[PDB]
Design a protein around this ligand. Structure first.
Ligand SMILES: [Mg+2]
Ligand SMILES: [Mg+2]
Ligand SMILES: [Mg+2]
Ligand SMILES: [Mg+2]
Ligand SMILES: [Mg+2]
Ligand SMILES: [Mg+2]
Ligand SMILES: [Mg+2]
Ligand SMILES: [Mg+2]
Ligand SMILES: [Mg+2]
Ligand SMILES: [Mg+2]
Ligand SMILES: [Mg+2]
Ligand SMILES: [Mg+2]
Lengths: 118, 148, 249, 38, 185
RNA sequence: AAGCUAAGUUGAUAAUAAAUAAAUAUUGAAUACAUAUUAAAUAUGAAGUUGUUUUAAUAAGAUAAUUAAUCUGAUAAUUUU
RNA sequence: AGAGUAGAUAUUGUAAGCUAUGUUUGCCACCUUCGACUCAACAUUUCCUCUUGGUUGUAAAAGCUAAGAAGGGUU
RNA sequence: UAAUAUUUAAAAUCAAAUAUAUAUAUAUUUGUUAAUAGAUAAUAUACGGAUCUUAAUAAUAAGAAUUAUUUA
RNA sequence: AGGUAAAUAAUCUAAAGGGAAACAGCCCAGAUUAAGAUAUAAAGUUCCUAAUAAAUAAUAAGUGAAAUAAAUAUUAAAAU
């Protein structure tokens, strides 16, 4: 019909970009957590520097942040597998897999955890 | 300021020489390299609205390096306007007919920018299967290089 | 007494190498070609008449080729010209008709201002004949076969029916105003043009024709004529060339 | 020959050989068991 | 395996190793042929061109060993075999017998041209290559002798191509080829 | 009668050669056997390919001429090959 | 699976499997003429001619089946 | 160590890494084949094209422009 | 089915710019007017064509190199 010339693989450059994006997302989360921790420290009664130093850093309480922190639910880039950085689970593909770059707004969308065996 | 001065030497066409016997670049790479020279992209005075490229003499083109089975299998094409008159010639066949020089030339042509200047640039490139050629005298040569 | 010359190291140290054999070289092409060994001669087609074989009593249409004043002018060699051939002249021509340059050329080669000059290409240096030497019909033997070149009669602008023997259309059964036309000249949009070499009306004749393996029937030095079996192309007084044939050598 | 995409030796006399970018099976006894791949 | 097996050399047989004049190279992994192995003996001599990674070893008896790529391994076995064959040629030279087994099918030497006459309405044959010597005791038997085992056998094959053995079984039989097994009428 | 024409006449259906397709082989390892090589070597093999032959175009090269009482062309006249 | 005087694979090859083509009958609704004559051009999934493998079913001759092959021809 | 019959797996198992008490234990995370054939139609080869697979002897010098995992 | 009917989101409709060879609807990004120094997005960096150097493996088919063709067969490789 109408030619949408989009390849089934990604170029190395694309892959690298994807990786970078993933890393950035992780970093954002990390930063958020750090901020929360330092706020907690300040509330308790410490300085900024002191808070930064502290061995026992506080985990976040809010559900979403906690979930993000868990690597079971939301892996970090170094943890993540090759097969999940550049492919998603498609319920109706051959091999039940599909290049992430096919997913509508893949540059914004985050999607790490494919199914366990698929 | 910088552009002001005697600019005659900049836009002088140098003759370069490449001995394909003594060059280990494979065909395509070599062609690409030559293309740049032809265009004149190597010189800082280049501007796209100007043919300012140098001359390239290729010699010993018989010893050019081609990889894989391309000598046998790589097919050059030519079509008249007339349906059914598609000529498809293998690289080896072409070589037998015209020479390795032709091969090289084709590659260079492909490399070059597709505009008026193209043909001139292509013609600047002078290729010879063996060593001997009529340009031996005019290749650029320095006085300090004369130890040999 | 030396001159200021330099030399690049890249070109000095470059080991000597011979360029291999190009097929599109003249030399190579020469080898390939299927050329005659001997030379030939220029002639004028005079007319046609019947030859009668006196033993079998059989009538053969024969065209008379007149060999007036045929002379080798000069020859061409592989070293200088890249092929082996002799330039033959035919017939005397009046100074007034000949260019100064051409007169000079003729003088160079001690011949009279010729009517028609033509090269005959040969195989090897052996085929050449000494220059300035005259040729007679006796250069050919009765019974031998020759290849003849001449320029066909011009038919002017011709239709497709005459050029290519097209069938035209029906004479009377509705057919209107197109009786001798060529019909379709292509297909629809999927060439969308007329292909090169489409047979179409146009000039016909006045072109070179080589007619091969004609038998020399007779050869009479006393009349300056050769007799050839059959029809030779072109009008009366057309210049013809005969070489010994290659297919039946 | 029997030209086909599946080339399998029938008997112990059949031997598998690969030439000219194709898999052949020649059989020293039964000429019927001569196969070529593609 | 074959390459490692040693090669006994009788006295009167030399196996010399040399370089070449203009070493040729073969690309596609590559293989450069610069070495020469020249075998000499009472019946003749022959030079075999050889890679570079191959090493002859002269004992008081010779060996051959290669510098352990698969290609090298493949070459090694071949080369030893070749030299063995050459050795055999140079002393007890090689020989192949062709038996013509059809009615009126026969062979005849015309000097050293061989004309095989087998049912054809035109006569045909070929000329023996240098180093090959044919003799014909009966007109139905032809014996080809030479120092080069490969060459002689090639020649034999060419001759037998003219009429291979039918399956019901007139033809030309090389050596001990009893390939024709007669189908039942 | 000329000319034009086929229903007439004459001729050609382009060799020799080179490399090949499917196929047929020699020796011969990798793999103690076998294996024509999707190994190194060595061969046969088609109305196909390359080429040749034919026509048209192009014009490298070659021969000669050089400011001219009749240099090379055009215009002009009488014309048909 | 089964035929094939025996034996799936010379030749045949049910129903079910996996594909290719866009030469048929359809479906969709982006978009509003069959033949004859003349001249054919292109393709190869080759009808003939050239080379070849298989053929208890290649004794030969005719065939059958398969590979290469589009040069010439195909009322 | 040869031959032998399956399988193409990190679930289990092993290795490595991160988080919890911590030289161990617990929990999570990651790591397991490649070629060739099969392969195909009609104006023209059709990665957009040139073209790309490397090699001693020698280059103040080329060494994938493919596929997979990465770095700056 | 570039089919049809609805659901959710985006874009197009009404959106120029960069990429996807060319491209309504894809990937990025919303043009007030310039200017062109610095960050860059998606995409790329032998030449055409703005910009590239490395590392480890695999491939020898031009497979492949921005549109992946299936069953199956052959050959190899690992694991038990
Ligand atoms: Mg599109
Ligand atoms: Mg006739
Ligand atoms: Mg076919
Ligand atoms: Mg195409
Ligand atoms: Mg591309
Ligand atoms: Mg719709
Ligand atoms: Mg509207
Ligand atoms: Mg837009
Ligand atoms: Mg909007
Ligand atoms: Mg705005
Ligand atoms: Mg490709
Ligand atoms: Mg593709």
């Amino acid at each position: 019909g109408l030619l949408w010339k989009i390849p089934w693989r990604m170029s190395t450059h694309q892959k690298t970009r994807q990786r970078e994006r993933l890393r950035n997302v992780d970093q954002v989360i990390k930063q958020l957590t750090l901020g929360l921790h330092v706020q907690r420290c300040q509330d308790k009664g410490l300085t900024y520097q002191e808070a930064m130093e502290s061995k026992k850093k506080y985990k976040p309480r809010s559900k979403s942040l906690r979930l993000l922190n868990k690597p079971s639910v939301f892996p970090k880039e170094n943890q993540m597998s090759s097969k999940d950085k550049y492919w998603t689970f498609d319920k109706k593909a051959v091999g039940y897999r599909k290049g992430i770059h096919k997913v509508p707004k893949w540059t914004k969308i985050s999607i790490r955890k494919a199914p366990k065996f698929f | 300021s910088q552009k002001i001065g005697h600019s005659g030497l900049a836009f002088a066409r140098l003759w370069h020489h490449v001995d394909v016997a003594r060059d280990k670049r494979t065909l395509g790479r070599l062609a690409s390299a030559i293309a740049i020279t032809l265009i004149g992209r190597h010189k800082p005075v280049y501007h796209p609205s100007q043919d300012c490229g140098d001359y390239v003499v290729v010699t010993n083109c018989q010893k050019i390096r081609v990889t894989g089975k391309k000598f046998e299998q790589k097919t050059y094409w030519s079509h008249s306007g007339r349906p059914g008159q598609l000529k498809l010639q293998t690289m080896n066949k072409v070589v037998a007919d015209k020479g390795f020089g032709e091969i090289l030339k084709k590659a260079v042509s492909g490399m070059l920018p597709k505009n008026k200047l193209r043909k001139q640039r292509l013609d600047r490139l002078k290729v010879f299967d063996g060593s001997e050629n009529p340009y031996k005298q005019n290749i650029t040569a320095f006085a300090h290089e004369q130890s040999s | 007494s030396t001159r200021p010359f330099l030399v690049a190291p890249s070109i000095a140290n470059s080991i000597t190498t011979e360029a291999p054999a190009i097929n599109h070289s003249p030399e190579l092409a020469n080898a390939r070609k299927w050329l005659p060994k001997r030379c030939g001669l220029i002639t004028r087609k005079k007319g046609m008449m019947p030859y009668f074989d006196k033993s079998t009593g059989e009538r053969s249409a024969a065209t008379i080729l007149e060999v007036n004043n045929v002379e080798v002018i000069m020859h061409r060699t592989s070293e200088v010209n890249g092929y082996f051939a002799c330039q033959v002249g035919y017939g005397s021509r009046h100074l007034s008709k000949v260019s100064r340059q051409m007169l000079g050329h003729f003088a160079s080669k001690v011949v009279n201002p010729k009517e028609h000059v033509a090269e005959f290409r040969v195989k090897d240096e052996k085929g050449l004949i000494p220059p300035g030497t005259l040729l007679k019909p006796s250069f050919f033997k009765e019974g031998q076969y020759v290849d003849v070149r001449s320029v066909s009669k011009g038919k002017g602008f011709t239709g497709v029916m005459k050029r290519y023997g097209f069938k035209g259309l029906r004479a009377s059964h509705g057919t209107s105003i197109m009786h001798r036309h060529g019909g379709s000249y292509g297909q629809n949009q999927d060439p969308g043009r007329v292909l090169p070499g489409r047979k179409m009306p146009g000039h016909m004749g006045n072109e070179h024709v080589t007619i091969q393996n004609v038998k020399v029937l007779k050869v009479d030095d006393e009349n300056n004529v050769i007799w050839v079996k059959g029809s030779v192309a072109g009008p009366k007084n057309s210049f013809v060339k005969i070489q010994d044939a290659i297919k039946k050598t | 020959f029997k030209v086909r995409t599946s080339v399998k030796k029938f008997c112990s006399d059949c031997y598998l050989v690969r030439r000219k970018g194709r898999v052949y099976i020649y059989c020293k006894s039964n000429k019927k068991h001569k196969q070529r791949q593609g | 395996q074959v390459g490692s097996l040693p090669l006994y050399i009788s006295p009167e047989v030399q196996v010399s190793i040399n370089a070449l004049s203009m070493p040729r190279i073969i690309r596609k992994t590559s293989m450069n042929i610069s070495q020469n192995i020249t075998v000499k003996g009472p019946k003749g001599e022959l030079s075999v061109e050889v890679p570079d990674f191959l090493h002859l070893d002269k004992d008081e008896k010779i060996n051959v060993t290669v510098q352990e790529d698969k290609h090298q391994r493949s070459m090694w076995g071949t080369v030893r075999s070749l030299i063995n064959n050459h050795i055999i040629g140079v002393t007890e030279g090689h020989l192949a017998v062709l038996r013509f087994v059809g009615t009126g099918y026969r062979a005849q030497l015309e000097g050293k041209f061989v004309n095989v006459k087998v049912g054809a309405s035109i006569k045909q044959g070929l000329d023996v290559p240098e180093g090959i010597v044919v003799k014909t005791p009966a007109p139905t038997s032809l014996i080809i002798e030479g120092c080069n085992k490969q060459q002689v056998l090639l020649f034999a094959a060419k001759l037998r191509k003219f009429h291979p053995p039918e399956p019901y079984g007139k033809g030309i039989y090389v050596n001990d080829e009893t390939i024709k097994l007669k189908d039942k009428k």
